[PDB]
Design a protein around this ligand. Structure first.
Ligand SMILES: *[C@@H]1O[C@H](CO)[C@@H](O[C@@H]2O[C@H](CO)[C@@H](O[C@@H]3O[C@H](CO[C@H]4O[C@H](CO[C@H]5O[C@H](CO)[C@@H](O)[C@H](O)[C@@H]5O[C@H]5O[C@H](CO)[C@@H](O)[C@H](O)[C@@H]5O)[C@@H](O)[C@H](O[C@H]5O[C@H](CO)[C@@H](O)[C@H](O)[C@@H]5O)[C@@H]4O)[C@@H](O)[C@H](O[C@H]4O[C@H](CO)[C@@H](O)[C@H](O)[C@@H]4O)[C@@H]3O)[C@H](O)[C@H]2NC(C)=O)[C@H](O)[C@H]1NC(C)=O
Ligand SMILES: *[C@@H]1O[C@H](CO)[C@@H](O[C@@H]2O[C@H](CO)[C@@H](O[C@@H]3O[C@H](CO[C@H]4O[C@H](CO)[C@@H](O)[C@H](O)[C@@H]4O)[C@@H](O)[C@H](O[C@H]4O[C@H](CO)[C@@H](O)[C@H](O)[C@@H]4O)[C@@H]3O)[C@H](O)[C@H]2NC(C)=O)[C@H](O)[C@H]1NC(C)=O
Ligand SMILES: *[C@@H]1O[C@H](CO)[C@@H](O[C@@H]2O[C@H](CO)[C@@H](O[C@@H]3O[C@H](CO)[C@@H](O)[C@H](O)[C@@H]3O)[C@H](O)[C@H]2NC(C)=O)[C@H](O)[C@H]1NC(C)=O
Ligand SMILES: *[C@@H]1O[C@H](CO)[C@@H](O[C@@H]2O[C@H](CO)[C@@H](O)[C@H](O)[C@H]2NC(C)=O)[C@H](O)[C@H]1NC(C)=O
Ligand SMILES: *[C@@H]1O[C@H](CO)[C@@H](O[C@@H]2O[C@H](CO)[C@@H](O)[C@H](O)[C@H]2NC(C)=O)[C@H](O)[C@H]1NC(C)=O
Ligand SMILES: *[C@@H]1O[C@H](CO)[C@@H](O)[C@H](O)[C@H]1NC(C)=O
Ligand SMILES: *[C@@H]1O[C@H](CO)[C@@H](O)[C@H](O)[C@H]1NC(C)=O
Ligand SMILES: *[C@@H]1O[C@H](CO)[C@@H](O)[C@H](O)[C@H]1NC(C)=O
Ligand SMILES: *[C@@H]1O[C@H](CO)[C@@H](O)[C@H](O)[C@H]1NC(C)=O
Ligand SMILES: *[C@@H]1O[C@H](CO)[C@@H](O)[C@H](O)[C@H]1NC(C)=O
Ligand SMILES: *[C@@H]1O[C@H](CO)[C@@H](O)[C@H](O)[C@H]1NC(C)=O
Ligand SMILES: *[C@@H]1O[C@H](CO)[C@@H](O)[C@H](O)[C@H]1NC(C)=O
Ligand SMILES: *[C@@H]1O[C@H](CO)[C@@H](O)[C@H](O)[C@H]1NC(C)=O
Ligand SMILES: *[C@@H]1O[C@H](CO)[C@@H](O)[C@H](O)[C@H]1NC(C)=O
Ligand SMILES: *[C@@H]1O[C@H](CO)[C@@H](O)[C@H](O)[C@H]1NC(C)=O
Ligand SMILES: *[C@@H]1O[C@H](CO)[C@@H](O)[C@H](O)[C@H]1NC(C)=O
Length: 893
């Protein structure tokens, strides 16, 4: 039975507020909304409709809060009877607290916290003599006096947090509150306001049970000593983020009735809990996270033995702790245990036989040893984390008795098997056992009733999953990571029932079956598809479909055939090498693509490269090697601003290559074995400042090697063998940096792709190394030896002599100047070379006598000086005599 005056007042209050988030929507002048009892946020007395509770609060959803923004109209005074006013996280006019709140005459609850109220506290709050709970904390209020607090003699809770606290004699004022029981002075300085012993003596008797004293820069035991003389009645004590240093006070023991001790995020709590804590017998929550305890765990548990039957949640994570966890079932009341990221180095043994009550256990990111305990003694575990440890032995058969586990992570251990009871789990939403040993075979019996599995990760184990035919899986799992798992000679037939997965990883399996017809279309939202290193055959033309969340498509090392699959818009890495594709790739830039890496090597494609690459903006690696293309290179190859590596070796192109002047940030450019023609590009030296690998072998070039090529100053590989070049060898090889510092190494040649792909979040991070890719590619050419620092100018019409500047070169590991026409004597000063492992100067018109310094070379592996007009008396050295007669043949010495 609402009073029309109160309803009009409420409407007037609403008029001044801009409720832009749907709150206060039930309010209004409409006829169907007349009765104010169902009006949201409003409660009324049944005998008479006077408003009692007005709680327009909100909450943080993750931050973000659906805050109101208006102005407190003074019409609320018409309510005349309310005893509850909650404005908890709203942001009204960022001004002083309204001065009419003092004239309510019946309030028993005021929560103006977590707003942006500013200014001082009005002095009229002395009229609020009937309050019981006051919460003005975490505002922008500035307090300098507390004389009003004396009149408010009926409070049981006071929270003035977040204030610019400057009241020096706060203890005297607070102690004048006989009925006070909870005090929140968080983030209020209070380290510069320490009551003297005279002030403490000149104080009344108050039994404060709960204290919130966090975010105060105490940093010492003497600053907070006063709380220890409310010892007769204390229940909860929060002292987090005070930068405390030294041993925790021994007086925290013998502090009976304590049920909570938040000591999170201190500086150095050296030594951990003292011997005085064997007297507690009532502890229920002890958080000592991020405090650097360095305590022995059995000692910690024997010091907590008093509260064995009462302790519920225990912290002790992110701090140094050593020992072994033994006899945890004797607590019989512990519910949550977080011993992660410690320096534990012991076993995990029960030995006691009684049942536990753990619901959340996390022993991850530390060291453990020995087998897992009999897990049937934890029939209430909800989230078991045991990863990043050293756990051996088979997973116990009792794992099927949990019957309530949701997340199981046993990765990075040394587990040797997986039991058959795992199937009877019916709420396991995420199973992760990657990077274990896990030998054996998995039958459908291991997955019979896994009805709620949405994440299965048996990554990189010597495992074998072989499900019998006519098995209908009971789960529609989102993430399928099964690399290096034998999934049967045929294509796994349990994927037919799956039509919602977003990440699929069937790589490194053993599949030698043609692609099934039912594997037509992937689920619309797919992010990772890695079918690499298998023997799958068929056409993948009608499987891509151009989704919107594609990130990885790796179909490398298979027996695929047919036309090129479509390249989606949002893909970042597109790998297709080691396949049997054929046709034309003209459909590769028809749409805007954002691929960082594009691999089409070791295939049998054909046709001219389309003039399409103007649409490619983010290509960093383009590898079209060993593919038998033809025609002129596209003029759009210069539009790739962010191009790093370009592989086009062994493809039989033609014509003068186009300018890639805009292609700065280019590091690898190999075009060997094709039919490219023309003079050496002038733009190689001018632009391309970050070039390190340049290979142009077995092409139809000509002309002089222009000296500008010396300006690269990062070149470690220069391949110009069998190209028909002529003239004189450049006299500027010192200009190269990495071949002048002996053991110097260049900056890493890396590219990175990152993403998140799980409801239970997981990080996908691929780091491709260009130099590793070059090493892998070069294994196809030279079986004997390859080197990462090589200068090659063999088999050309070069004339003149070797300039006397390679003697100063230090880190060069290979040198091949053969089948040229070189006149004169070999470099006098060759002994200055240190890390030479190969040297060839065969088939040349060399004249002179081999210098004695050749004797003091050290690590030369292969040497050839055949077919030269040289002198005799080969130097008597250590490894020189180890070479055969072939290396010095064909000479008239
Ligand atoms: C005046 O008004 C203001 C309004 O602004 C009032 O202030 C509000 O008061 C209410 C109380 O009614 C508060 O709600 C309560 O919040 C608490 C705290 O929840 C938060 O912490 C939880 C625990 O976090 C630890 O543990 C987790 C792992 O479990 C870890 O990830 C955390 O990082 C943290 O870890 C730390 O501690 C570990 C163990 O000690 C250590 O190992 C570790 O190293 C760390 O040191 C957390 O679970 C919780 O998360 C919730 O929210 C997220 C996101 O929304 C969601 O995903 C989760 O699932 C959770 O839902 C919070 O981060 C909470 O414990 C209370 O729970 C009660 O209510 C629920 C209701 O269902 C019951 O089920 C519970 O059993 C329990 O009874 C309650 O929700 C509110 O937070 C607070 N808000 C503000 C802004 O102040 C004020 O009280 C009013 N004044 C007066 C006088 O009343
Ligand atoms: C599609 O799927 C295939 C198959 O799964 C992927 O190819 C494999 O990718 C993984 C992940 O990158 C590779 O595993 C890694 O190999 C690195 C190199 O291995 C050599 O060096 C190590 C150390 O010297 C030797 O022991 C080893 O025998 C090799 O000689 C390792 O260094 C990596 O180990 C590091 O990471 C793991 C996991 O974080 C840690 O546990 C380790 O302690 C260490 O820190 C790792 O093992 C694997 O080599 C690849 N195999 C093949 C055949 O390519 C494709 O990458 C995937 N496609 C895409 C796009 O992701
Ligand atoms: C420096 O580069 C030249 C080429 O630029 C390398 O010459 C190659 O050397 C191999 C090994 O001797 C030759 O193979 C030979 O093939 C014939 C058959 O034709 C066989 O009878 C020989 O026994 C030998 O296997 C290869 O033909 C030759 N390339 C040529 C002549 O074009 C040379 O090896 C490089 N030097 C170093 C140290 O690597
Ligand atoms: C735990 O509480 C007991 C008292 O219940 C403490 O014992 C006191 O101190 C010594 C024991 O070494 C004896 O004089 C008496 O047993 C007690 N003296 C009193 C009550 O005046 C015991 O010291 C406490 N534990 C710790 C570690 O201090
Ligand atoms: C680069 O991509 C753009 C957009 O994807 C292509 O331009 C569109 O091409 C389609 C297909 O022929 C036409 O239907 C649109 O009308 C085109 N729009 C515009 C604004 O041109 C473009 O053809 C691609 N580049 C090359 C060289 O083909
Ligand atoms: C409702 O009003 C009556 C008389 O005015 C009072 O006795 C009673 O306590 C009120 N109810 C509440 C919940 O305040
Ligand atoms: C507080 O109560 C006294 C008692 O009558 C009254 O005189 C005074 O005006 C009240 N304060 C305010 C701000 O109304
Ligand atoms: C309260 O305890 C402190 C801590 O030792 C002590 O110095 C002070 O004299 C005590 N005062 C009263 C009134 O109990
Ligand atoms: C000490 O206590 C007496 C007792 O009433 C009081 O009058 C006096 O003001 C107190 N001293 C201080 C500094 O408050
Ligand atoms: C577990 O699987 C068996 C085999 O069909 C079934 O009979 C049983 O009902 C399942 N348990 C459930 C659904 O709780
Ligand atoms: C796939 O799962 C998502 C949630 O993970 C759900 O919203 C969607 O409806 C599912 N798809 C189908 C076809 O049920
Ligand atoms: C599966 O293929 C790998 C490829 O390296 C091979 O080493 C392994 O022996 C194969 N296993 C079976 C069972 O065929
Ligand atoms: C797939 O290709 C490899 C080598 O490219 C070949 O050895 C294998 O026989 C091929 N598989 C089939 C089914 O033809
Ligand atoms: C020598 O090489 C450096 C390396 O960048 C270059 O800056 C310098 O101009 C070169 N000197 C010449 C080509 O005379
Ligand atoms: C050696 O060959 C070079 C070719 O330019 C040139 O110096 C000359 O023709 C020859 N003889 C001498 C002594 O250099
Ligand atoms: C190598 O030996 C020769 C001896 O003829 C010497 O002149 C030269 O300095 C040596 N090189 C070194 C020590 O690096």
């Amino acid at each position: 039975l609402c009073i029309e005056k109160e309803r009009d007042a409420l409407l007037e209050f609403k008029r001044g507020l801009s409720d832009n988030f749907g709150q206060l929507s039930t309010w209004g002048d409409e006829e169907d909304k007349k009765e104010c009892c169902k009006w949201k946020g409003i409660e009324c007395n049944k005998t008479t409709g006077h408003v009692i509770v007005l709680d327009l609060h909100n909450a943080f959803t993750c931050c973000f809060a659906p805050r109101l923004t208006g102005k407190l109209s003074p019409s609320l005074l018409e309510l005349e009877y309310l005893n509850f006013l909650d404005l908890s996280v709203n942001e009204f006019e960022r001004s002083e607290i309204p001065r009419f709140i003092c004239s309510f005459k019946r309030l028993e609850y005021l929560n103006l916290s977590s707003s942006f109220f500013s200014g001082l506290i009005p002095t009229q709050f002395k009229n609020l003599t009937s309050l019981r709970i006051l919460d003005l904390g975490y505002n922008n209020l500035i307090v300098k006096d507390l004389t009003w607090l004396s009149h408010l003699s009926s409070l049981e809770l006071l929270s003035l947090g977040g204030s610019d606290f400057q009241v020096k004699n706060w203890f005297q004022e607070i102690t004048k509150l006989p009925l006070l029981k909870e005090l929140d002075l968080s983030l209020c300085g209070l380290s510069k306001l320490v009551p003297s012993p005279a002030e403490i003596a000149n104080s009344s008797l108050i039994s404060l049970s709960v204290l919130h004293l966090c975010c105060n820069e105490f940093s010492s035991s003497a600053k907070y000593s006063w709380l220890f003389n409310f010892s007769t009645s204390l229940t909860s004590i929060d002292l987090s983020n005070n930068q405390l240093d030294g041993q925790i006070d021994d007086r925290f023991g013998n502090l009976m009735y304590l049920e909570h001790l938040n000591l999170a995020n201190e500086l150095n709590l050296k030594g951990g809990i003292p011997s005085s804590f064997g007297n507690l017998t009532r502890l229920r929550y002890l958080d000592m996270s991020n405090t650097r305890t360095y305590q022995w765990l059995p000692e910690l548990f024997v010091r907590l033995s008093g509260s064995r039957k009462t302790l519920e949640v225990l912290g002790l994570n992110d701090n140094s702790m050593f020992g072994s966890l033994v006899d945890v079932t004797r607590f019989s009341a512990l519910k949550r245990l977080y011993l992660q990221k410690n320096v534990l180095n012991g076993f995990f043994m029960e030995r006691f036989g009684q049942v536990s009550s753990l619901e959340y256990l996390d022993l991850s990111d530390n060291q453990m040893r020995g087998p897992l305990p009999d897990l049937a003694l934890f029939p209430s575990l909800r989230e078991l984390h045991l990863g990043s440890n050293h756990f051996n032995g088979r997973i116990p058969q009792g794992i099927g008795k949990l019957s309530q586990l949701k997340i199981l992570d046993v990765s990075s251990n040394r587990l040797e098997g997986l039991p058959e009871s795992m199937g009877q789990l019916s709420n396991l939403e995420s199973f992760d056992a990657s990077y274990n040993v896990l030998k054996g075979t998995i039958t459908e019996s291991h997955l019979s009733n896994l009805s709620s599995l949405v994440d299965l990760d048996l990554s990189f184990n010597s495992l074998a999953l072989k499900t019998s035919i006519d098995w209908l899986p009971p789960f529609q799992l989102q993430v399928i990571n099964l690399p290096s798992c034998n999934l049967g000679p045929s294509f796994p037939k349990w994927l037919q029932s799956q039509n919602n997965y977003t990440v699929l990883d069937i790589s490194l399996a053993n599949i030698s079956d043609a692609l099934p017809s039912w594997f037509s279309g992937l689920p619309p939202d797919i992010k990772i598809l890695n079918l690499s290193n298998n023997q799958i055959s068929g056409r993948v033309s009608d499987l891509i479909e151009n989704a919107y969340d594609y990130m990885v498509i790796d179909l490398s090392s298979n027996n695929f055939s047919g036309p090129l699959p479509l390249v989606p818009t949002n893909v970042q890495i597109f790998y297709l090498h080691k396949n049997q594709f054929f046709g034309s790739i003209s459909s590769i830039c028809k749409s805007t693509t954002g691929a960082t890496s594009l691999d089409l090597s070791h295939n049998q494609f054909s046709g001219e490269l389309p003039d399409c690459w103007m649409n490619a903006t983010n290509l960093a690696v383009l590898n079209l090697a060993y593919n038998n293309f033809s025609g002129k290179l596209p003029q759009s190859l210069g539009s790739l601003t962010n191009l790093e590596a370009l592989y086009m070796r062994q493809n039989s192109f033609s014509g003068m290559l186009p300018s890639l002047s805009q292609c700065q940030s280019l590091q690898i450019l190999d075009l060997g074995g094709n039919k490219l023609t023309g003079r050496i590009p002038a733009w190689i030296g001018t632009d391309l400042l970050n070039l390190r690998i340049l290979s142009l072998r077995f092409n139809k070039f000509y002309g002089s090697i222009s000296p500008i090529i010396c300006q690269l100053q990062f070149l470690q590989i220069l391949d110009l063998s069998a190209n028909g070049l002529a003239g004189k060898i450049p006299q500027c090889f010192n200009n190269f940096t990495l071949l002048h510092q002996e053991n110097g190494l260049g900056e890493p040649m890396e590219f990175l792709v990152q993403g998140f792909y799980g409801k239970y979040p997981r990080h996908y991070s691929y780091l491709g190394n260009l130099l590793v890719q070059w090493k892998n590619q070069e294994a196809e050419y030279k079986n004997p030896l390859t080197y990462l620092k090589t200068i090659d100018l063999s088999s050309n019409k070069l004339v003149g002599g070797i300039p006397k500047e390679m003697a100063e070169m230090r880190g060069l590991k290979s040198l091949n100047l053969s089948r040229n026409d070189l006149n004169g004597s070999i470099i006098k000063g060759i002994g200055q070379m240190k890390m030479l492992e190969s040297l060839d100067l065969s088939r040349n018109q060399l004249s002179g006598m081999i210098p004695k310094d050749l004797a003091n070379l050290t690590f030369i592996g292969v040497l050839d000086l055949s077919n030269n007009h040289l002198s005799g008396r080969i130097p008597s050295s250590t490894q020189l005599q180890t070479f055969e007669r072939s290396s010095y043949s064909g000479n008239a010495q």
